[PDB]
Ligand SMILES: CN1N=C(C(=O)O)[C@@H]2[C@@H](C(=O)O)NC[C@@H]21
Ligand SMILES: [Cl-]
């Protein structure tokens with residue numbers, strides 16, 4: 156049977172490809188994670204149907220501990236694979252399985268160009284420049300859970316001021332372009348955006364380190380096969396090639 160792949164529109168990972176007509180099925184999509192999926196389907200010899208996650212979320216918990224997003228789709232066995240920039244986290248590992256990472260990254264800062272700012276520290280110890288993160292994203296959770304001084308402080312700011320947190324990267328990137336606002340997000344998106352928007356830039360370096368993995372329901376037989384396939388793609392340099400294909404723009 157074809158595998159059900161849950162995913163989520165997110166540049167440059169998964170996008171509707173441009174067309175004069177209306178496309179349907181898998182042919183609708185293009186992007187880094189679509190190329191990854193094609194590589195995985197070939198190596199492992201499965202067929203698949205792409206389905207965008209209904210609630211358009213990656214996956215977070217509520218106060219009662221219930222999951223939404225692609226994480227939930229896997230938990231309920233409504234999808235066999237999550238092929239997306241799904242950040243590997245301690246908490247998510249308790250609910251689903253991940254392949255080994257296919258991409259490594261970290262939290263960093265998106266901000267308009269040309270300022271005294273050079274680091275998170277510069278950002279926390281001042282007040283003129285607002286800053287925030289996507290609400291309930293892996294990046295926000297990092298600041299919430301942190302015990303580091305400068306990040307407990309930043310979490311204090313972004314959690315008190317109820318305009319600091321944005322609904323998604325799209326809105327957050329809007330804010331950096333219209334207001335005096337710095338977005339806390341993942342370095343993969345920042346590199347993509349700053350290659351295409353020469354008025355934006357990354358502030359400082361990576362403040363943590365993490366990876367993206369293919370999500371499967373806990374105990375899936377495919378997890379280990381996907382890990383083997385990712386290792387093969389690494390050996391063949393195809394993750395390098397795929398990244399340069401979809402990260403290119405100053
Ligand atoms: C592009 N994204 N940025 C994020 C962030 O948390 O900064 C999200 C994270 C997740 O899986 O929650 N990885 C994909 C999303
Ligand atoms: Cl076409």
Ligand SMILES: [Cl-]
Nearest residue numbers: 205206207208
């Ligand atoms: Cl769909």
Ligand SMILES: [Cl-]
Nearest residue numbers: 214215293296
């Ligand atoms: Cl999370």
Ligand SMILES: [Zn+2]
Nearest residue numbers: 194197391393
């Ligand atoms: Zn190949």
Ligand SMILES: [Zn+2]
Nearest residue numbers: 231232233372
């Ligand atoms: Zn089941």
Ligand SMILES: [Zn+2]
Nearest residue numbers: 392393395396
């Ligand atoms: Zn290479």
